[PDB]
Amino acid sequence: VGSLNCIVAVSQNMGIGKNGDLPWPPLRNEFRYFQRMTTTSSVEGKQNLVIMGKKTWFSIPEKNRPLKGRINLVLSRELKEPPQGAHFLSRSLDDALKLTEQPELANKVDMVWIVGGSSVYKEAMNHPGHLKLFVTRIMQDFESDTFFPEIDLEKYKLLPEYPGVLSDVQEEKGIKYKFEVYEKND
Ligand SMILES: NC(=O)c1ccc[n+]([C@@H]2O[C@H](COP(=O)([O-])OP(=O)(O)OC[C@H]3O[C@@H](n4cnc5c(N)ncnc54)[C@H](OP(=O)(O)O)[C@@H]3O)[C@@H](O)[C@H]2O)c1
Ligand SMILES: N[C@H]1N[C@@H](N)[C@@H]2C[C@@H](CN3CC[C@H]4CCCCC43)CC[C@@H]2N1
């Protein structure tokens, strides 16, 4: 498997969700970026793996599940099989990664993107080795009930730039946001 990456949209107050949905009104271009990042594979004939916790899967509108063109893995210690529309179920993040290594997912998957939620991020983030964080900074405060964990800037470096990622402040529905890329190697 290729690169291990995390992707998240965060408010100023570090919020990522409120009552099973996003704290802000839907930003279509933000969603378009998330689609593009997570779906594009750096290698022909391969596909990306999207790993998400159970609540994340159920918060995605049904019309949008499973995330098309990607292998959809749901994490849960309570499900007996993958939910309707999902491809794989794992009981922990290491089994999800161990499975990428089964000759089955082997060489079909180039990259694996953690798309949420809190617990999954927190864990990927402390995971050892090379990891990139694609962070959309939502430049305002939004009442949230779920939060993104602290980024340790002694380990994660903000990159000056990245191919395919706009460096300019974006604006939509009068909300300003910016895209950032962080990298770690420990
Ligand atoms: N703004 C954004 O970028 C963004 C990104 C994603 C989600 N969201 C929002 O954030 C919220 C969902 O967040 P969340 O943190 O509550 O949910 P989550 O992490 O998606 O779901 C937590 C459930 O997932 C399973 N799980 C999670 N981590 C696991 C692990 N390491 N091993 C095994 N199972 C694990 C457990 O399922 P069992 O209990 O079944 O064991 C746990 O109850 C929703 O509001 C969603 O709308 C926002
Ligand atoms: N940058 C970025 N990081 C992500 N991981 C994102 C997860 C996406 C998952 N979706 C699509 C529609 C959703 C409704 C409610 C909750 C979650 C939902 C939403 C946009 C994301 N953007």
mmCIF file of C-alpha atoms and ligand atoms in Angstrom:
data_model
loop_
_atom_site.group_PDB
_atom_site.id
_atom_site.type_symbol
_atom_site.label_atom_id
_atom_site.label_comp_id
_atom_site.label_asym_id
_atom_site.label_seq_id
_atom_site.Cartn_x
_atom_site.Cartn_y
_atom_site.Cartn_z
ATOM 1 C CA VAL A 1 0.000 0.000 0.000
ATOM 2 C CA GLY A 2 1.033 3.578 -0.695
ATOM 3 C CA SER A 3 0.703 6.585 1.562
ATOM 4 C CA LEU A 4 -1.296 6.708 4.786
ATOM 5 C CA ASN A 5 -3.169 9.982 5.042
ATOM 6 C CA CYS A 6 -5.751 11.716 7.099
ATOM 7 C CA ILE A 7 -8.290 14.214 5.741
ATOM 8 C CA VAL A 8 -10.550 16.555 7.870
ATOM 9 C CA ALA A 9 -12.472 19.916 7.659
ATOM 10 C CA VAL A 10 -12.089 21.689 11.091
ATOM 11 C CA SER A 11 -13.603 24.920 12.578
ATOM 12 C CA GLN A 12 -11.583 27.522 14.428
ATOM 13 C CA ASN A 13 -12.673 25.917 17.716
ATOM 14 C CA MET A 14 -11.489 22.457 16.431
ATOM 15 C CA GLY A 15 -14.969 21.205 15.709
ATOM 16 C CA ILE A 16 -15.671 18.443 13.201
ATOM 17 C CA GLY A 17 -19.323 17.370 13.735
ATOM 18 C CA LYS A 18 -22.560 18.303 15.522
ATOM 19 C CA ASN A 19 -25.503 15.804 15.996
ATOM 20 C CA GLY A 20 -24.232 13.434 13.296
ATOM 21 C CA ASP A 21 -23.584 16.159 10.761
ATOM 22 C CA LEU A 22 -21.058 18.881 9.968
ATOM 23 C CA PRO A 23 -21.017 22.003 12.141
ATOM 24 C CA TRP A 24 -21.373 24.341 9.123
ATOM 25 C CA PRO A 25 -23.692 24.619 6.178
ATOM 26 C CA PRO A 26 -22.457 22.393 3.327
ATOM 27 C CA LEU A 27 -19.543 23.821 1.291
ATOM 28 C CA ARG A 28 -19.786 22.211 -2.142
ATOM 29 C CA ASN A 29 -16.201 22.995 -3.214
ATOM 30 C CA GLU A 30 -14.835 21.731 0.073
ATOM 31 C CA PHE A 31 -16.787 18.465 -0.587
ATOM 32 C CA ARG A 32 -15.540 18.480 -4.169
ATOM 33 C CA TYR A 33 -11.859 18.697 -2.901
ATOM 34 C CA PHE A 34 -12.444 15.830 -0.392
ATOM 35 C CA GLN A 35 -13.842 13.717 -3.284
ATOM 36 C CA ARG A 36 -10.892 14.467 -5.543
ATOM 37 C CA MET A 37 -8.231 13.964 -2.925
ATOM 38 C CA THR A 38 -9.518 10.674 -1.627
ATOM 39 C CA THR A 39 -10.446 9.234 -4.996
ATOM 40 C CA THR A 40 -7.405 9.951 -7.163
ATOM 41 C CA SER A 41 -4.824 7.182 -7.227
ATOM 42 C CA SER A 42 -1.210 7.839 -8.081
ATOM 43 C CA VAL A 43 -0.980 4.418 -9.928
ATOM 44 C CA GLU A 44 -3.061 2.985 -12.817
ATOM 45 C CA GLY A 45 -5.519 0.232 -12.150
ATOM 46 C CA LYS A 46 -5.228 0.827 -8.409
ATOM 47 C CA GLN A 47 -7.797 2.282 -6.078
ATOM 48 C CA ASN A 48 -7.691 4.159 -2.772
ATOM 49 C CA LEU A 49 -9.005 2.735 0.563
ATOM 50 C CA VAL A 50 -11.203 4.984 2.746
ATOM 51 C CA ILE A 51 -11.320 4.062 6.457
ATOM 52 C CA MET A 52 -14.026 5.489 8.707
ATOM 53 C CA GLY A 53 -15.622 4.835 12.123
ATOM 54 C CA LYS A 54 -19.240 3.783 12.345
ATOM 55 C CA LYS A 55 -20.810 7.110 13.120
ATOM 56 C CA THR A 56 -18.994 8.662 10.151
ATOM 57 C CA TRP A 57 -20.439 6.114 7.795
ATOM 58 C CA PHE A 58 -23.972 6.718 9.095
ATOM 59 C CA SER A 59 -23.679 10.560 8.888
ATOM 60 C CA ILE A 60 -22.973 10.402 5.066
ATOM 61 C CA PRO A 61 -26.229 10.830 3.119
ATOM 62 C CA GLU A 62 -27.403 7.453 1.871
ATOM 63 C CA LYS A 63 -27.370 8.682 -1.709
ATOM 64 C CA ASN A 64 -23.623 9.272 -1.203
ATOM 65 C CA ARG A 65 -22.690 5.877 0.356
ATOM 66 C CA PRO A 66 -20.538 4.064 -0.457
ATOM 67 C CA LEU A 67 -18.068 6.687 -1.554
ATOM 68 C CA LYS A 68 -17.741 5.739 -5.225
ATOM 69 C CA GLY A 69 -14.414 4.709 -6.726
ATOM 70 C CA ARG A 70 -12.930 3.927 -3.364
ATOM 71 C CA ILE A 71 -12.765 0.766 -1.196
ATOM 72 C CA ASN A 72 -14.953 1.658 1.869
ATOM 73 C CA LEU A 73 -13.867 0.193 5.174
ATOM 74 C CA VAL A 74 -15.911 0.736 8.302
ATOM 75 C CA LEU A 75 -14.351 0.365 11.812
ATOM 76 C CA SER A 76 -16.478 -1.085 14.679
ATOM 77 C CA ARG A 77 -16.167 -3.529 17.574
ATOM 78 C CA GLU A 78 -19.954 -4.000 17.615
ATOM 79 C CA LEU A 79 -21.030 -4.728 13.989
ATOM 80 C CA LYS A 80 -21.041 -8.388 12.872
ATOM 81 C CA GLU A 81 -20.702 -7.554 9.201
ATOM 82 C CA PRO A 82 -20.199 -4.393 7.151
ATOM 83 C CA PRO A 83 -23.245 -2.101 7.011
ATOM 84 C CA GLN A 84 -25.325 -2.066 3.825
ATOM 85 C CA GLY A 85 -23.138 -0.558 1.087
ATOM 86 C CA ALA A 86 -19.764 -0.919 2.778
ATOM 87 C CA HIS A 87 -17.045 -3.215 1.530
ATOM 88 C CA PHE A 88 -15.085 -4.238 4.671
ATOM 89 C CA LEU A 89 -15.524 -4.133 8.425
ATOM 90 C CA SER A 90 -12.509 -4.073 10.862
ATOM 91 C CA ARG A 91 -12.395 -4.101 14.618
ATOM 92 C CA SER A 92 -9.383 -1.870 14.913
ATOM 93 C CA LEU A 93 -7.094 0.343 12.832
ATOM 94 C CA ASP A 94 -4.200 -2.248 12.746
ATOM 95 C CA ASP A 95 -6.438 -4.973 11.313
ATOM 96 C CA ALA A 96 -7.604 -2.424 8.770
ATOM 97 C CA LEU A 97 -3.941 -1.902 7.802
ATOM 98 C CA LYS A 98 -3.036 -5.628 8.178
ATOM 99 C CA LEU A 99 -5.762 -6.353 5.598
ATOM 100 C CA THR A 100 -4.183 -4.033 2.987
ATOM 101 C CA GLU A 101 -1.401 -6.566 3.084
ATOM 102 C CA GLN A 102 -3.629 -9.585 2.262
ATOM 103 C CA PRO A 103 -2.853 -10.500 -1.364
ATOM 104 C CA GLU A 104 -6.544 -9.685 -1.762
ATOM 105 C CA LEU A 105 -6.372 -5.903 -1.120
ATOM 106 C CA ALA A 106 -2.715 -6.140 -1.991
ATOM 107 C CA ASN A 107 -1.956 -4.264 -5.181
ATOM 108 C CA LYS A 108 -5.437 -3.001 -5.633
ATOM 109 C CA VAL A 109 -4.940 -0.240 -3.145
ATOM 110 C CA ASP A 110 -2.414 2.538 -3.559
ATOM 111 C CA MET A 111 -3.488 4.905 -0.741
ATOM 112 C CA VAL A 112 -5.389 4.831 2.447
ATOM 113 C CA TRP A 113 -7.221 7.813 3.632
ATOM 114 C CA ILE A 114 -8.673 8.099 7.208
ATOM 115 C CA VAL A 115 -11.804 10.155 6.717
ATOM 116 C CA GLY A 116 -12.927 10.302 10.410
ATOM 117 C CA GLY A 117 -14.023 10.486 13.156
ATOM 118 C CA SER A 118 -12.231 11.643 16.299
ATOM 119 C CA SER A 119 -11.148 8.232 17.631
ATOM 120 C CA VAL A 120 -9.828 7.082 14.264
ATOM 121 C CA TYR A 121 -7.891 10.342 13.770
ATOM 122 C CA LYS A 122 -6.460 10.282 17.275
ATOM 123 C CA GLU A 123 -5.159 6.760 16.671
ATOM 124 C CA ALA A 124 -3.792 7.232 13.081
ATOM 125 C CA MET A 125 -2.104 10.360 14.338
ATOM 126 C CA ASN A 126 -0.120 8.552 17.027
ATOM 127 C CA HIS A 127 0.600 5.658 14.616
ATOM 128 C CA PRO A 128 4.346 5.324 13.920
ATOM 129 C CA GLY A 129 6.011 6.367 10.716
ATOM 130 C CA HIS A 130 5.054 8.494 7.739
ATOM 131 C CA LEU A 131 1.749 10.285 7.760
ATOM 132 C CA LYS A 132 0.229 13.323 6.049
ATOM 133 C CA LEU A 133 -2.690 15.384 7.434
ATOM 134 C CA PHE A 134 -4.803 17.282 4.803
ATOM 135 C CA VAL A 135 -6.500 19.853 6.957
ATOM 136 C CA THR A 136 -9.173 22.284 5.676
ATOM 137 C CA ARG A 137 -9.142 25.157 8.183
ATOM 138 C CA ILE A 138 -12.743 26.586 8.457
ATOM 139 C CA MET A 139 -11.957 30.151 9.585
ATOM 140 C CA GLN A 140 -14.850 30.663 12.079
ATOM 141 C CA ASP A 141 -16.300 29.174 15.250
ATOM 142 C CA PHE A 142 -19.081 26.585 14.903
ATOM 143 C CA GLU A 143 -20.872 24.984 17.915
ATOM 144 C CA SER A 144 -19.621 21.355 17.704
ATOM 145 C CA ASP A 145 -19.988 18.168 19.884
ATOM 146 C CA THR A 146 -17.024 16.293 18.324
ATOM 147 C CA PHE A 147 -13.465 17.665 18.052
ATOM 148 C CA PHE A 148 -10.304 17.031 16.095
ATOM 149 C CA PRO A 149 -7.319 16.147 18.362
ATOM 150 C CA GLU A 150 -4.424 18.533 18.954
ATOM 151 C CA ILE A 151 -1.814 18.672 16.242
ATOM 152 C CA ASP A 152 1.593 18.302 17.774
ATOM 153 C CA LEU A 153 3.701 20.823 15.868
ATOM 154 C CA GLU A 154 6.841 19.338 17.313
ATOM 155 C CA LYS A 155 6.023 16.277 15.078
ATOM 156 C CA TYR A 156 3.900 17.597 12.206
ATOM 157 C CA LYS A 157 5.346 20.225 9.883
ATOM 158 C CA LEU A 158 3.045 22.576 7.969
ATOM 159 C CA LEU A 159 4.185 22.336 4.291
ATOM 160 C CA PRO A 160 4.729 25.590 2.372
ATOM 161 C CA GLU A 161 2.849 24.115 -0.509
ATOM 162 C CA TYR A 162 1.608 20.967 -2.183
ATOM 163 C CA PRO A 163 0.693 19.961 -5.764
ATOM 164 C CA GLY A 164 -3.097 20.068 -6.408
ATOM 165 C CA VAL A 165 -3.778 22.098 -3.241
ATOM 166 C CA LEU A 166 -4.763 25.764 -3.459
ATOM 167 C CA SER A 167 -2.735 28.035 -1.153
ATOM 168 C CA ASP A 168 -5.260 30.874 -1.330
ATOM 169 C CA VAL A 169 -8.040 31.552 1.147
ATOM 170 C CA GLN A 170 -11.285 30.208 -0.309
ATOM 171 C CA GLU A 171 -14.720 31.535 0.458
ATOM 172 C CA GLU A 172 -18.171 30.026 0.088
ATOM 173 C CA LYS A 173 -21.540 30.902 1.577
ATOM 174 C CA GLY A 174 -19.565 33.699 3.199
ATOM 175 C CA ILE A 175 -17.406 31.250 5.109
ATOM 176 C CA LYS A 176 -13.670 31.536 4.647
ATOM 177 C CA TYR A 177 -11.493 28.464 4.605
ATOM 178 C CA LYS A 178 -7.956 27.428 3.664
ATOM 179 C CA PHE A 179 -6.331 24.084 2.812
ATOM 180 C CA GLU A 180 -3.196 22.931 4.702
ATOM 181 C CA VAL A 181 -0.902 19.889 4.449
ATOM 182 C CA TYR A 182 1.090 18.669 7.424
ATOM 183 C CA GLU A 183 3.742 15.953 7.293
ATOM 184 C CA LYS A 184 5.337 13.707 9.904
ATOM 185 C CA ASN A 185 8.014 10.942 9.741
ATOM 186 C CA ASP A 186 8.726 9.252 13.112
HETATM 187 N N1 LIG B 1 -15.681 17.859 9.479
HETATM 188 C C1 LIG B 1 -15.117 16.715 9.086
HETATM 189 O O1 LIG B 1 -14.150 16.534 8.436
HETATM 190 C C2 LIG B 1 -15.729 15.385 9.518
HETATM 191 C C3 LIG B 1 -14.975 14.089 9.132
HETATM 192 C C4 LIG B 1 -15.688 12.867 9.703
HETATM 193 C C5 LIG B 1 -16.764 12.932 10.488
HETATM 194 N N2 LIG B 1 -17.357 14.180 10.740
HETATM 195 C C6 LIG B 1 -18.525 14.279 11.702
HETATM 196 O O2 LIG B 1 -17.873 13.840 12.981
HETATM 197 C C7 LIG B 1 -18.805 12.901 13.664
HETATM 198 C C8 LIG B 1 -18.573 11.383 13.665
HETATM 199 O O3 LIG B 1 -17.587 11.384 14.676
HETATM 200 P P1 LIG B 1 -17.215 10.405 15.834
HETATM 201 O O4 LIG B 1 -15.938 10.647 16.373
HETATM 202 O O5 LIG B 1 -18.301 10.357 16.766
HETATM 203 O O6 LIG B 1 -17.397 8.941 15.120
HETATM 204 P P2 LIG B 1 -16.538 7.824 14.423
HETATM 205 O O7 LIG B 1 -15.200 7.812 14.913
HETATM 206 O O8 LIG B 1 -16.946 7.878 13.029
HETATM 207 O O9 LIG B 1 -17.458 6.556 15.031
HETATM 208 C C9 LIG B 1 -16.970 6.100 16.354
HETATM 209 C C10 LIG B 1 -17.462 4.582 16.290
HETATM 210 O O10 LIG B 1 -16.662 4.097 15.445
HETATM 211 C C11 LIG B 1 -15.992 2.882 15.834
HETATM 212 N N3 LIG B 1 -14.586 3.092 15.954
HETATM 213 C C12 LIG B 1 -14.018 4.298 15.931
HETATM 214 N N4 LIG B 1 -12.728 4.262 16.119
HETATM 215 C C13 LIG B 1 -12.503 2.866 16.182
HETATM 216 C C14 LIG B 1 -11.236 1.997 16.331
HETATM 217 N N5 LIG B 1 -10.039 2.581 16.417
HETATM 218 N N6 LIG B 1 -11.418 0.664 16.361
HETATM 219 C C15 LIG B 1 -12.669 0.221 16.279
HETATM 220 N N7 LIG B 1 -13.820 0.859 16.170
HETATM 221 C C16 LIG B 1 -13.641 2.215 16.129
HETATM 222 C C17 LIG B 1 -16.710 2.560 17.182
HETATM 223 O O11 LIG B 1 -17.759 1.781 16.708
HETATM 224 P P3 LIG B 1 -18.467 0.529 17.727
HETATM 225 O O12 LIG B 1 -19.015 1.382 18.784
HETATM 226 O O13 LIG B 1 -19.523 0.068 16.768
HETATM 227 O O14 LIG B 1 -17.390 -0.322 18.187
HETATM 228 C C18 LIG B 1 -17.099 3.961 17.727
HETATM 229 O O15 LIG B 1 -18.423 3.935 18.465
HETATM 230 C C19 LIG B 1 -20.138 13.054 12.910
HETATM 231 O O16 LIG B 1 -20.701 14.297 13.317
HETATM 232 C C20 LIG B 1 -19.690 13.315 11.445
HETATM 233 O O17 LIG B 1 -20.717 14.094 10.965
HETATM 234 C C21 LIG B 1 -16.789 15.448 10.307
HETATM 235 N N1 LIG B 2 -11.781 18.009 4.196
HETATM 236 C C1 LIG B 2 -12.827 17.025 4.507
HETATM 237 N N2 LIG B 2 -12.555 16.031 5.279
HETATM 238 C C2 LIG B 2 -13.356 15.071 5.397
HETATM 239 N N3 LIG B 2 -12.959 13.855 6.041
HETATM 240 C C3 LIG B 2 -14.656 15.251 5.064
HETATM 241 C C4 LIG B 2 -15.670 14.176 5.329
HETATM 242 C C5 LIG B 2 -16.907 14.305 4.433
HETATM 243 C C6 LIG B 2 -17.988 13.273 4.931
HETATM 244 N N4 LIG B 2 -19.327 13.738 4.662
HETATM 245 C C7 LIG B 2 -19.966 14.040 3.402
HETATM 246 C C8 LIG B 2 -21.370 14.607 3.795
HETATM 247 C C9 LIG B 2 -21.312 14.564 5.293
HETATM 248 C C10 LIG B 2 -22.324 14.914 6.104
HETATM 249 C C11 LIG B 2 -22.154 14.817 7.419
HETATM 250 C C12 LIG B 2 -21.008 14.340 7.944
HETATM 251 C C13 LIG B 2 -20.009 13.938 7.118
HETATM 252 C C14 LIG B 2 -20.184 14.054 5.788
HETATM 253 C C15 LIG B 2 -17.472 15.744 4.433
HETATM 254 C C16 LIG B 2 -16.357 16.746 3.929
HETATM 255 C C17 LIG B 2 -14.989 16.375 4.428
HETATM 256 N N5 LIG B 2 -14.005 17.217 4.145
#
